Short mmCIF file of C-alpha atoms in Angstrom, two decimals:
data_model
loop_
_atom_site.label_atom_id
_atom_site.label_comp_id
_atom_site.label_asym_id
_atom_site.label_seq_id
_atom_site.Cartn_x
_atom_site.Cartn_y
_atom_site.Cartn_z
CA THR A 20 0.00 0.00 0.00
CA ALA A 21 3.09 2.22 0.33
CA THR A 22 6.11 1.53 -1.87
CA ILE A 23 9.66 2.84 -1.59
CA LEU A 24 12.49 2.56 -4.13
CA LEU A 25 15.98 2.52 -2.66
CA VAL A 26 18.59 3.45 -5.25
CA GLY A 27 22.24 2.76 -4.44
CA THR A 28 25.21 0.63 -5.40
CA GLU A 29 25.81 -1.03 -2.01
CA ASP A 30 23.40 -4.00 -1.96
CA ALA A 31 24.08 -5.00 1.65
CA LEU A 32 23.43 -1.55 3.12
CA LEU A 33 20.26 -1.14 1.05
CA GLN A 34 19.09 -4.50 2.36
CA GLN A 35 19.81 -3.70 5.99
CA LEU A 36 18.03 -0.36 5.59
CA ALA A 37 15.06 -2.14 4.00
CA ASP A 38 14.97 -4.65 6.84
CA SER A 39 15.10 -1.73 9.27
CA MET A 40 12.14 -0.06 7.57
CA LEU A 41 10.19 -3.33 7.57
CA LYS A 42 10.86 -3.93 11.28
CA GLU A 43 7.66 -3.60 13.37
CA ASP A 44 5.40 -1.86 13.45
CA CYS A 45 3.56 0.07 10.74
CA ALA A 46 -0.13 0.84 10.20
CA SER A 47 0.44 0.65 6.46
CA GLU A 48 1.76 -2.22 4.35
CA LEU A 49 5.24 -1.26 3.17
CA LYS A 50 6.92 -2.60 0.05
CA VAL A 51 10.60 -2.10 -0.68
CA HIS A 52 12.31 -2.26 -4.06
CA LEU A 53 16.06 -1.90 -4.58
CA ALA A 54 17.86 -0.67 -7.68
CA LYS A 55 21.57 -0.26 -8.27
CA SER A 56 20.86 2.59 -10.68
CA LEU A 57 18.34 4.43 -12.85
CA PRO A 58 16.88 3.94 -15.37
CA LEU A 59 15.34 0.67 -14.17
CA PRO A 60 15.60 -2.27 -16.63
CA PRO A 66 4.76 -0.97 -9.97
CA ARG A 67 3.59 2.21 -8.25
CA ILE A 68 6.47 3.97 -6.50
CA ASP A 69 5.61 6.58 -3.88
CA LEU A 70 9.08 7.60 -2.74
CA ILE A 71 12.61 7.33 -4.14
CA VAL A 72 15.60 7.43 -1.81
CA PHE A 73 19.05 7.90 -3.31
CA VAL A 74 21.53 6.33 -0.93
CA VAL A 75 24.88 8.00 -1.54
CA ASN A 76 28.12 6.59 -0.15
CA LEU A 77 30.47 9.48 0.60
CA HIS A 78 33.49 7.16 0.59
CA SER A 79 32.78 6.06 -2.99
CA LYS A 80 33.24 8.31 -6.02
CA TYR A 81 31.39 5.69 -8.04
CA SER A 82 28.43 6.02 -5.69
CA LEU A 83 28.39 9.79 -6.24
CA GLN A 84 28.64 9.43 -10.01
CA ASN A 85 25.91 6.78 -10.12
CA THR A 86 23.59 9.03 -8.10
CA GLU A 87 24.31 12.01 -10.36
CA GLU A 88 23.63 9.99 -13.51
CA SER A 89 20.54 8.24 -12.14
CA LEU A 90 18.98 11.58 -11.21
CA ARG A 91 18.83 12.57 -14.87
CA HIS A 92 16.24 9.86 -15.54
CA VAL A 93 13.84 10.85 -12.77
CA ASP A 94 10.66 12.68 -13.79
CA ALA A 95 10.40 16.14 -12.23
CA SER A 96 7.13 15.27 -10.49
CA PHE A 97 9.09 12.89 -8.30
CA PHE A 98 11.10 15.81 -6.91
CA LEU A 99 7.87 17.32 -5.58
CA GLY A 100 8.56 15.82 -2.14
CA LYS A 101 8.79 12.22 -3.38
CA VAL A 102 12.60 12.09 -3.52
CA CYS A 103 15.01 11.97 -0.60
CA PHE A 104 18.81 11.80 -0.57
CA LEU A 105 20.48 9.64 2.06
CA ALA A 106 24.21 10.22 2.55
CA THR A 107 26.23 7.66 4.45
CA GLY A 108 29.75 8.24 5.78
CA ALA A 109 29.33 12.00 6.33
CA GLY A 110 29.58 11.69 10.11
CA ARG A 111 32.93 9.94 9.72
CA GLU A 112 36.22 11.83 9.63
CA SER A 113 37.36 9.31 7.00
CA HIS A 114 34.91 10.62 4.39
CA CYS A 115 35.82 13.05 1.60
CA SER A 116 34.50 16.55 2.26
CA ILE A 117 34.35 17.33 -1.46
CA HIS A 118 31.89 14.46 -1.89
CA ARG A 119 29.73 15.78 0.93
CA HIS A 120 29.67 19.23 -0.62
CA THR A 121 28.87 17.64 -3.97
CA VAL A 122 25.81 15.84 -2.56
CA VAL A 123 24.66 18.93 -0.65
CA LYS A 124 24.76 20.75 -3.99
CA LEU A 125 22.94 17.81 -5.62
CA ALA A 126 20.11 17.83 -3.06
CA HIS A 127 19.91 21.60 -3.40
CA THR A 128 19.75 21.42 -7.20
CA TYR A 129 16.94 18.89 -7.19
CA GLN A 130 15.26 20.69 -4.28
CA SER A 131 15.01 17.51 -2.22
CA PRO A 132 15.79 16.66 1.43
CA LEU A 133 19.31 15.53 2.31
CA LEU A 134 19.39 13.11 5.24
CA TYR A 135 22.52 11.68 6.90
CA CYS A 136 23.03 8.27 8.48
CA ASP A 137 25.80 5.76 9.15
CA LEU A 138 23.91 2.72 7.82
CA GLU A 139 26.49 0.41 9.42
CA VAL A 140 25.35 1.50 12.88
CA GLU A 141 22.31 -0.49 14.04
CA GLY A 142 20.61 2.13 16.24
CA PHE A 143 21.25 5.05 13.90
CA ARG A 144 19.93 3.07 10.95
CA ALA A 145 16.89 2.13 13.05
CA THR A 146 16.04 5.76 13.75
CA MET A 147 16.63 6.75 10.13
CA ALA A 148 14.34 3.90 9.09
CA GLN A 149 11.65 5.33 11.36
CA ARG A 150 12.03 8.70 9.67
CA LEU A 151 11.90 7.17 6.18
CA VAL A 152 8.86 5.04 7.02
CA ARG A 153 7.06 8.24 8.02
CA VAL A 154 8.16 10.08 4.86
CA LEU A 155 7.03 7.07 2.77
CA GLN A 156 3.61 7.02 4.42
CA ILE A 157 3.29 10.74 3.72
CA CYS A 158 4.22 10.28 0.06
CA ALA A 159 1.75 7.39 -0.23
CA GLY A 160 -1.05 9.68 0.95
CA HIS A 161 -1.57 7.84 4.23
CA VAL A 162 -0.87 10.72 6.64
CA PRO A 163 -3.83 13.07 7.25
CA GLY A 164 -3.14 16.66 6.22
CA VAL A 165 0.35 16.03 4.82
CA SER A 166 1.24 15.24 1.21
CA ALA A 167 4.61 14.99 -0.51
CA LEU A 168 3.98 18.58 -1.55
CA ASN A 169 3.95 19.58 2.12
CA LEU A 170 7.41 18.03 2.57
CA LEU A 171 8.83 20.80 0.37
CA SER A 172 10.60 23.31 2.63
#
């Protein structure tokens, strides 16, 4: 009844995030699809671009994939999720690049270390709520209202 597309090149992290989102409990029935890239080879309510700040390939793949997304998706139905930004080991230039990306496509930029169980759990809560909003399940709040 609410469907999210996770786009990212790290299968394992996408899977653990998906599992985190599916972890109990949710009033709506959540479906998760994963893609390594866009364009894809089903109704999709929310797209989350998971960007690995330690991987230049991740950045490039996000940048390229974005070109295939219809503009109506950026009306609150796209979120960026940067991983590695809280770590001193990450490249600052990449972080700036993704901040500029999220700004350009006027979409939220969220940060999480997906390798940390608790942090990923909380982020999954946030994303479940955003997904429900985008799917029209939250009274008085549409994807349009997410725009800020």
